[PDB]
Amino acid sequence: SGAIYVGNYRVVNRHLATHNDWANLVWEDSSRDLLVSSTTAQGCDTIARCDCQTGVYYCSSRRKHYPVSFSKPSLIFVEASEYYPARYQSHLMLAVGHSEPGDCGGILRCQHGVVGIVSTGGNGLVGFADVRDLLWLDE
Ligand SMILES: NC(=O)[C@H]1CCCN(C(=O)[C@@H]2CCSc3ccccc32)C1
Ligand SMILES: [Zn+2]
């Protein structure tokens, strides 16, 4: 679990969105596993606007942060789960690292701010849904 709070927005994994996220929906994309809802309170997270390929992510199943090198956002084939059929997930970045069910929503950050959130795992890999292209989060 986990979300990004920026301005009057909350960014969560679409498969973990609550009834309240859907009732205050701003934007959602099943192909990215992202959903953004509006909030009454002001958020203070900073979103990176960069092309970093190194950063640090939070892994809740280890209560630890890990440094990682990650691939550029791309279309990656993801196996069927209870939330989605087998499909290509877009804007996904992979790194070698630990991630298991319950780790989605962990923030990946570089020196410029928030890069994305954990969205996939297994096999000694961890996948992050990129949010750096969502320039509207800052306006
Ligand atoms: N973005 C998606 O399509 C997600 C939806 C939830 C299920 N997905 C996983 O990757 C899960 C949880 C993250 S960790 C993990 C480790 C081993 C096997 C599977 C998983 C795919
Ligand atoms: Zn950066």
From Swiss-Prot:
Active site: H15 (for protease 2a activity), D33 (for protease 2a activity), C104 (for protease 2a activity)
Transmembrane spans: none
Catalytic reaction(s) noted: Selective cleavage of Tyr-|-Gly bond in the picornavirus polyprotein
Amino acids binding Zn(2+) 1: C50, C52, C110, H112
Source taxon at top rank: Viruses
Subunit structure: Homodimer.
Known role: Cysteine protease that cleaves viral polyprotein and specific host proteins. It is responsible for the autocatalytic cleavage between the P1 and P2 regions, which is the first cleavage occurring in the polyprotein. Also cleaves the host translation initiation factor EIF4G1, in order to shut down the capped cellular mRNA translation. Inhibits the host nucleus-cytoplasm protein and RNA trafficking by cleaving host members of the nuclear pores. Counteracts stress granule formation probably by antagonizing its assembly or promoting its dissassembly.
Protein name, UniProt field: Protease 2A
Lineage, uppermost ranks: Viruses, Riboviria, Orthornavirae, Pisuviricota, Pisoniviricetes
Interval of the full protein contained in this chain: 869 to 1007 of 2193
